[PDB]
Design a protein around this ligand. Structure first.
Ligand SMILES: [Cl-]
Ligand SMILES: [Cl-]
Lengths: 437, 439
């Protein structure tokens, strides 16, 4: 059977020619306006990214290569005896657009584990960093330190042609992905435990390797991380982390510098800590209700929150018109594994009444929860109680979607992202000249 | 006593914010550009997608810092005593406030940066243990990211400050970071290319002098060159990859450390921060081929060969600027006042005398004039900075002035998070087809 690289080598030329023909025959078609309020409002609504892996369906939720969450939960290969989709199977789908067989996933898992040994200088680096340096900073530092191994950087310096960039980008990406669970686990053991990691089982999959090194053999913990790392793998190219990695990657920086930069954007409080924000709100709610998850007590707390200008964290979509299927997938996991967990029963009680209160409030068009409203409770259940580590887990997942698009961008020879800038003084000049024609 | 940078800026940004607010409220619906399909598939070239106050490129007069040309800042900005060169700390004041600081204000700002220049021990340990084969730019952004433990904005945000006070902690982190950048860069240079031994910071020295001192020199002509170098590379609009990257990461409220580190990683890209080294590599190849013959006949032959072979003359040819880069002329003048007999400079000057006419007669170059990158390497080579894998670190030590100036301004006016919309190629096809069917 074909490997991932072999199958992608047959698919990318078709995509590259299709893109060139598409732009040649339709490049002059205007697809949007640029209003002054958009360049001053973070380019909101501007089509400014070509991202193949995932598209947000406003009616069915995020779609990975046309597949919904229910689609990948049904079609993607699973580990033996498990019901959860494997994140490396989704990576295959993101990169190629095709569903891999069972044997292709396991061979890809084995290939990832064979690339998972951290170089000596990275282990030394991480063991000496102070514990009060945030794990996301330690995360992107470790990723940057792997640049000495970059096959793409060496290939560029040795005059490799542009049409061969993808191959070394691919190898760097798989080299990087194999070491991400080891880096994340090393940071977790050093900062929060005794600094002792296990060893990488070469037959373990991506998620199982991360959980084992973190320090558990619980198969239910392994299944949760398979679900977690899958559903967080990709969400369009407009978000800060995806856009940052594409931007740095478009100047031909290696996957290591592109992922490290994307992680720093994911570290931003407005981007990657929605998980932590929900959990702090849950604990602040739990301290005043004291096991009372009744309809009246929760609805009163929700009305007092909505009437005080605040919002319910994790609720209210801008575009999605129903409950995030990623939220439902985590809800099914909790109901099958620990339905009587107090922190879940609190989350479940909010889900039972919060859509109705937000609707009655009338200031929320789509009163439904997202993935971040349900992820922290499951992590807490398995002992991942240190929320300052949650964005690291987010980064271990989203790196799949980030590196898939990075490989694709080099395969088609995507150009450097360089828009034009003006000062406010100059924008007032441009606008004055336009409005007086 | 005169106002500090923080005190003067705190008086200026409320005016800038109200002007931005009223401008967008009245004119927000005005269309300023189109988005063609070839643009979203072409890196958004020509798209207005950034608000960058510090610098704007004047197509006739070169890059302007808050309206000031290179000649303007050479005249108006304060200088170090006995020196004719502009101080980068002075340009930073101008980039942030739009106003020219006094001599005493620049000196107190230099002293403040030096008081924050002490690297914490875990950064010293980290840099010393990094292997020599790890690229300096990678070590540069690693060390900057390691300083995140000192971030006052990160600690204040977690405590729960108001949105109106974001800029204040962003400002402090930015000055804390600026003070340590010469130390980080010099430590890297000693460890990778020298004996790993470094001097101590002089609390009375300026930003460029501290950098040259720790690298291992006290030559005043070297210090003056670095004053000029760090000044003219400080900022160049907001569309370039490193400036755009730091704005994008900063728009998610990441600290200046993570924002600058991400910007440096973009600057490390071969298509962004290596024009200086590309020109130098091409200069050395010419010298080997011409056997040190720099005659007009010999150089013009080599230039026609390069253009007829389908290649470009590195550093020559602007897309917009219609004359020689004033930053090139400022560097040409420095060499003629310090070492006009240097052979490598005579090569650069010999090229400058004949390349514009050759490119013009060749007829394939609209603006056949050299940029700042055509002349920076030869100056760095004269004073012993011959390790070209270090030039982008020096570029970053300068460009961080403009990056951090805009990041402070972004937080002061509460700039929104940059988040455009993406589509797959399949969805773009459906979008284009529906648009064309209605035309
Ligand atoms: Cl985002
Ligand atoms: Cl650029």
């Amino acid at each position: 059977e074909k490997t991932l690289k072999e199958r992608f080598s047959e698919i990318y030329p078709i995509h590259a020619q299709d893109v060139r023909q598409f732009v040649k025959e339709h490049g002059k078609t205007k697809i949007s306006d640029v209003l002054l309020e958009q360049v001053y409002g973070g380019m909101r609504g501007i089509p400014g990214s070509v991202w193949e892996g995932s598209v947000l369906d406003p009616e069915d939720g995020i779609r990975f290569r046309g597949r919904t969450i229910a689609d990948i939960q049904k079609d993607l290969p699973k580990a033996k005896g498990s019901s959860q989709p494997l994140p490396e199977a989704l990576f295959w789908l993101l990169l190629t657009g095709e569903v891999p067989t069972q044997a292709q996933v396991e061979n890809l898992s084995a290939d990832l584990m064979s690339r998972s040994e951290l170089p000596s200088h990275v282990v030394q680096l991480l063991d000496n960093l102070p514990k009060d340096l945030h794990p996301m900073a330690q995360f992107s530092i470790a990723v940057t330190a792997l640049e000495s191994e970059s096959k793409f950087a060496k290939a560029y310096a040795q005059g490799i042609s542009k049409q061969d960039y993808w191959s070394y980008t691919f190898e760097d990406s798989l080299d990087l992905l194999g070491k991400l669970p080891v880096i994340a686990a090393k940071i977790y053991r050093n900062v929060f435990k005794d600094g002792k990691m296990g060893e990488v089982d070469p037959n373990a999959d991506y998620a199982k390797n991360l959980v084992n090194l973190i320090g558990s053999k619980d198969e239910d913990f392994v299944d949760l991380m398979r679900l977690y790392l899958t559903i967080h793998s990709d969400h369009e190219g407009g978000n800060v982390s995806a856009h940052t990695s594409h931007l740095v990657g478009s100047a031909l920086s290696s996957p290591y510098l592109s992922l490290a930069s994307g992680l720093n954007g994911l570290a931003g409080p407005l981007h990657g800590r929605a998980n932590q924000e929900v959990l702090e709100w849950l604990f602040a709610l739990k301290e005043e209700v004291n096991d009372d998850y009744s309809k009246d007590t929760i609805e009163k707390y929700l009305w007092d929150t909505l009437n005080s200008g605040r919002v319910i964290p994790g609720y209210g979509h801008a575009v999605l018109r129903k409950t995030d299927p990623r939220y439902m997938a985590q809800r099914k996991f909790a109901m099958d594994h620990f339905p009587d967990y107090e922190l879940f029963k609190l989350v479940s009680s909010i889900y039972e009444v919060a859509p109705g209160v937000l609707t009655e409030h009338g200031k929320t068009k789509n009163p439904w929860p997202n993935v971040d409203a349900h992820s922290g409770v499951l992590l807490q259940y398995y002992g991942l109680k240190e929320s300052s580590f949650y964005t690291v887990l987010f980064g271990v997942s989203r790196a799949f979607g980030i590196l898939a698009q990075l490989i694709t961008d080099r395969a088609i020879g995507a150009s450097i992202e360089r828009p034009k800038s003006y000062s406010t003084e100059k924008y007032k000049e441009l606008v004055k000249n336009i409005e007086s024609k």
